[model samples]
Target: VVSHFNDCPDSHTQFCFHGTCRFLVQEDKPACVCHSGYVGARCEHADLLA
Candidate 1:
């Protein structure tokens, strides 16, 4: 995987729907940092489903 910064357009629309979220690279892999209770590749998942 390659670590790099990206602009997630849907980060606030589709990715993070419940709370704040951001698109970023982690350990050479693309990842999403979501608020507590939010989780997923783009912060799409919610609750403990992350």
Candidate 2:
């Protein structure tokens, strides 16, 4: 699913499953963050210790 934020340029945003995903902040400059139900800088799978 993709959503747009008025605060951002063109309001380009998206939601993806567990995988390597990144956001383009600018030319050659990018930022990344993990999706929900996941964590860590690399967005590795999460362990459920239940």
Candidate 3:
């Protein structure tokens, strides 16, 4: 996982390559990638329904 910053609080630009997962927070905005066996925009699958 890789990230980039733009001089902002909690601001992060994230990158996900191949099957890797990454997370980023920018200008109060959050972005993330889900890991294996997981699926969601925020990597949260508590209700994935197995």
Candidate 4:
């Protein structure tokens, strides 16, 4: 396909809030590389332990 469904390259804001997002080539899906204070599939969860 020319474009991915949830590719985070230009749509980081839509997926990751306080972190970075990347597409998993093996799985072909979007994922959030969470920040120091955040964690979740979409980086939507704040790390309360941080």
Candidate 5:
């Protein structure tokens, strides 16, 4: 069966280094929802001014 709520595929940390990361549904698909200061497909990129 297909599994939903898949974990972040980034070999890095599950959550952004200094932010929160959670599994969310966007456009009916799963995505990594990053907290403020983080941005990227996997929320791996950090925003210095965020």
Candidate 6:
């Protein structure tokens, strides 16, 4: 859809790149929860996958 990070749909989105977008109480807002080998607000950075 659009490039954004919020209200992650049940179907999820590609905005996270290689991560998951979920709304956590700690975050208080929708964010991209990156997976291993990835880190960034949108999980666009690779630390180990490279």
**Which wins on TM-score, candidate 1 or candidate 2?**
2
Question: Model 1, 9: alpha-carbon shift in Å?
Answer: 6.0
> Which residue pairs in model 5 clash with each other?
none
Candidate 6 lDDT, 1-50, residue by residue in tens:
24434466544456667787665443445556778767666778887535
> Which runs in model 2 stand beyond 4 Å of their true positions?
1-20, 23-26
Per-residue lDDT of model 4, residues 1-50, tens digit only: 56444545654347667776677554567666776756566667787633
Between candidates 2 and 4, the one scoring higher on lDDT is 4
Sort all candidates by lDDT, best to worst.
4, 6, 1, 5, 2, 3
lDDT of 5 by residue, 1-50 (tens): 35444454444344445444444323233344457656665555676633
Give the per-residue lDDT digits (tens) of candidate 2, residues 1-50: 24322222222223333544445434322344556666555455564511
Error of 1 at 3 (Å): 18
Q: Which segments of candidate 6 are over 4 A away from where they belong?
A: 1-7, 10-14, 23-29, 48-50
What TM-score would every model get versus the actual structure?
0.29, 0.35, 0.30, 0.41, 0.30, 0.40
Spell out the clash pairs found in candidate 6: none
Q: Which ten residues in a row have the lowest lDDT in candidate 3?
A: 9-18
- What RMSD does each model have against the real structure? 6.2, 8.8, 8.2, 5.6, 6.5, 8.6
Candidate 3 stretches with Cα past 4 Å from truth are 1-30
C-alpha RMSD between model 4 and the true structure = 5.6
lDDT of each: 0.51, 0.42, 0.41, 0.62, 0.47, 0.61
In candidate 1, position 2 carries an lDDT of 67
Best by lDDT: 4
> After aligning candidate 3 to the native by TM-score, how far in Å is the CA of 6 from where it should be?
9.8
As a whole number from 0 to 100, the lDDT of residue 5 in candidate 3 is: 36
lDDT score at residue 44, model 4, on the 0-100 scale? 71
